[PDB]
Design a protein around this nucleic acid. Sequence first.
DNA 1: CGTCCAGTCTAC
DNA 2: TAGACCTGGACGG
Length: 266
Amino acid sequence: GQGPELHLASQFVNEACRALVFGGCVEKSSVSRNPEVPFESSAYRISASARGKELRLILSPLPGAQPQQEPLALVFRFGMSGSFQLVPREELPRHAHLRFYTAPPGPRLALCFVDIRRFGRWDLGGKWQPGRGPCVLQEYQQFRENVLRNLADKAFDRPICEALLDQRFFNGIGNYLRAEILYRLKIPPFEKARSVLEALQNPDLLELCHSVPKEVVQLGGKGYGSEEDFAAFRAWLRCYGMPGMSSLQDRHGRTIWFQGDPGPLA
DNA sequence: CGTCCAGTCTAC
DNA sequence: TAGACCTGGACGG
């Protein structure tokens, strides 16, 4: 997912796990080529927070949980299929690659990182990816100034629809969002990134990088609401994959949707 | 059946 | 920077 999806996953984990207590190890699937999670505790709480296209879990042991241990942080990137589900222990989904198990008393559940295509990754540190810009959702001012302050970067030589996927500057923006953001302002996709941004030294392209993802979060759904959780989202799209929209391929063969003028660098 | 389509991460 | 990395759904013979 993109920014809003990671945000909604974080919200789901905090809400679902709020009154749960986990115990045991953190079981990785043998099939998953991500790291073993070396954590085990008689009783620990799980919480989440998001930043752009990253999600941090914190495993926090209870007072007197054994063994004595500091809380452990994990950072996930979801790839294309990543997600969290809370299921009964005995009905793990296909492709649950990392599982955390509730501790009795009560229904024996499993919080699962589910990732069909296995593009999602997790790291033991708790650190955000160095290089990643500030979050378009929760760090708008930082995000905005990081762009305007660095227009001389080679990244802004690229056309705008290519620049918007640079997670050094648009941490959280992915394919549907660049399409929907550009369509709101009718900015040609293959306009030169530096040229579109020097025009602002009216909601503008950088406000919309904040406000458009925020519209998706405020919708809810996407597996964290209530596959009809996607009804609203499908109806909310104005561009991405819509009848009578144009669509090219950027230099990395990613599909950009737009109306009218492709712009000078197609 | 068959083929094509849907964000990094790292080796060249 | 391409290509590699993966599964399943959507769409066509």
